[PDB]
A paper describes a structure:
Here, we show that Pseudomonas aeruginosa OprC is an outer membrane, TonB-dependent transporter that is conserved in many Proteobacteria and which mediates acquisition of both reduced and oxidised ionic copper via an unprecedented CxxxM-HxM metal binding site. As indicated by the successful structure solution, OprC contains a single bound copper and shows the typical fold of a TBDT, with a large 22-stranded β-barrel occluded by an N-terminal approximately 15 kDa plug domain that, like in other TBDTs, completely occludes the lumen of the barrel. The copper binding site comprises residues Cys143 and Met147 in the plug domain and His323 and Met325 in the barrel wall. The CxxxM-HxM configuration, which coordinates the copper in a tetrahedral manner, is highly unusual and has, to our knowledge, not been observed before in copper homeostasis proteins.
We next asked whether OprC also binds Cu(I). Since it is challenging to maintain copper in its +1 state during crystallisation, we used silver (Ag(I)) as a proxy for Cu(I) and determined the co-crystal structure of WT OprC in the presence of 2 mM AgNO3. This is possible because the protein used for crystallisation only had approximately 60% copper occupancy. Data were collected at 8,000 eV, at which energy the anomalous signal of copper is very small (0.6 e−, compared to 4.2 e− for Ag). Strikingly, and in sharp contrast to Cu(II), the anomalous map of OprC WT crystallised in the presence of silver shows not one but 3 anomalous peaks. The first, very strong peak (Ag1; 23σ) is located at the same site as in OprC crystallised with Cu(II) and is coordinated by the same residues (Cys143, Met147, His323, and Met325). The other 2 silver sites have lower occupancies (Ag2, approximately 10σ and Ag3, approximately 10σ) and are each coordinated by 3 methionines of the methionine track (Met286, Met339, and Met343 for Ag2; Met341, Met343, and Met348 for Ag3), as seen also, for example, for Cu(I) in the Ctr1 copper transporter. Only 5 Met residues form the 2 sites (Met343 is shared between the two), and this, combined with the fact that the track has 11 or 12 methionines, suggests that there are more than 2 metal binding sites. The distance between Ag2 and Ag3 is approximately 6.5 Å, i.e., large enough for 2 metal ions to be bound simultaneously, consistent with the fact that Ag was present at approximately 10-fold excess during crystallisation (approximately 0.2 mM OprC and 2 mM Ag). While direct measurement of the affinities of the methionine binding track sites would be challenging, the structural data suggest that the methionine track provides at least 2, and possibly more, binding sites for Ag(I), and, by extension, for Cu(I).
Numbering used by the authors: 66 to 444, 450 to 723
Write the structure that this text describes.
Amino acid sequence: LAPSVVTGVAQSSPLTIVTNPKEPRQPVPASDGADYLKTIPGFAVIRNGGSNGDPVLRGMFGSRLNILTNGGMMLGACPNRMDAPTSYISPETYDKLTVIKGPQTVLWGPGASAGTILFEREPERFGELGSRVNASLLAGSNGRFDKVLDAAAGNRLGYLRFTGNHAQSDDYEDGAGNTVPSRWKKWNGDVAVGWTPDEDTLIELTAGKGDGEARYAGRGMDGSQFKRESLGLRFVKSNVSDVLEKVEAQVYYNYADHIMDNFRLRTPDPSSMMPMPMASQVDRRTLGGRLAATWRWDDFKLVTGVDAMRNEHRARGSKYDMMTDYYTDADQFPWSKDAVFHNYGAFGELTWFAAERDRLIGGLRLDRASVKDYRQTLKHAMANPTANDTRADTLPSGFVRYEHDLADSPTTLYAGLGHAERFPDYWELFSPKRGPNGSVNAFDKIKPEKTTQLDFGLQYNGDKLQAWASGYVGVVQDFILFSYREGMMGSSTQATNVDARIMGGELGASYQLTGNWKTDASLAYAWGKNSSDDRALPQIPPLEARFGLTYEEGDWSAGSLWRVVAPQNRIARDQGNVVGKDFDKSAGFGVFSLNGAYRVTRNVKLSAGVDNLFDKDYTEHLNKAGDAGFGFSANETVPEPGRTFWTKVDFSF
Ligand SMILES: [Ag+]
Ligand SMILES: [Ag+]
Ligand SMILES: [Ag+]
């Protein structure tokens, strides 16, 4: 019953991790989706600045991860992914974060090669007329200050719910006393209206908005705006029949409006490729829906449904007349549409409870994906050879999983085969300046990515000791890979298709030593190989381990955490994704941190922490290369923060 601070999350069900994001996390997160996944073994984060990291799962990056918010899909618009999906998510506003590792589900959209991530909010359960609030404030080093509010009121028949947050930090300092360009600010406000005409019905309308700004240690530009707009409507019916346990319909609309420039959060580097004030605006409009029925009968559960999705991308730039140094901002020009994606899918999952200690699950889905290139020209300007052209493909995926509970031990074993196929996304088709060799551009030739992967592992849910492991081996056909070349002026990317082998796993245990002392540990490993070129895959996080120690008496608790990270010597220089490249073997490091928590009232709880107690100067292997405009050298990557203190108070009524 004693309050805690979360240093790491364990796996509770096979392949499935579930956590409540509202608890204090020990490497305290910069109020961003990617930082709440640091806590779960298998995740790493490309650091861009102080916030807005790009999450990497088992070495896979980007659209290989399926990031859902209330079953809806929010996607960002920057061509260089300053606004990864998780930039718009504020996790402590959500109630449940769950992660399914590997291509082992079909219920939540196409192409979840690496895994799916589901932030949800469970609906209110009001009986009498009533209300509830929970809130939190947080203050830390470097001007870090966060407010979070969650309030609802309603009764048997419906409810109003408000969720909001405001969060900011100024530039942090690394372990050497250098201050890192990394100031950020974020806010969100979202409302939900729910109507529950009887206990077998739920209709809910959601709407919300958010904005932010972020300085980027790399990049060469900063993000001055991250406008989000979201509209959602869903519909749940329970127990409509004896076999038809549930029917869920849902429709959602998301809009991202991003602005990047070099004069609002920095001053234009007078000796770069951008000495002139320049901004670029992009937006992304996303409309999509789901409809699914769950059938339960005998020893079988069956979920069948269809989903659909459209999304569109547009952009406009600034202009700088140079011999009259007059600046025309981007809002003075029209939008140029440049891409439209469509997807329609149909899916089903079947669970056979072969009684007792045996479970067998299989799913399939078939997807029709299509894109149209709307760029009339390229970037001064030249013709686009694929203007108005279209591409489509029909892509099937599916999986089988078997689960076995043992006789003696409280042990579950499991193994699964999964095949997943993913249509290339906006960044793989539109951001590279060159496609495969012999191609007119990326849009024309980049093939879908096809992943076949074997997942297996076990859980020991004993008393005193809980343990879990999950491994994976797989091959990827036509893995989409970026290469960087230096043609004198500027850097130029090239997307290609290669074949890859991948493997790895995570394991962890927590032992309850006494009634007061618990210890736990985790290990995460990833390995990747480009078979086409016989060399390592780029941007693969090195071997990582975490050891925690926690004492809890009555109302209070104290924790320690050691994070130790191996060097990464398997690299692929000048290859990577759309965001970063490999360049140098990384050094290992260890980082130590302390936290404490104390329940004052049944409504008020306190916590505090020191991150990086020993002020270690360290950089992660994945982090982006720092920009020549600031104090960063040649492919030196942005360092991690130095010692930081934080304190937090949680309220609940
Ligand atoms: Ag941008
Ligand atoms: Ag620029
Ligand atoms: Ag310019």
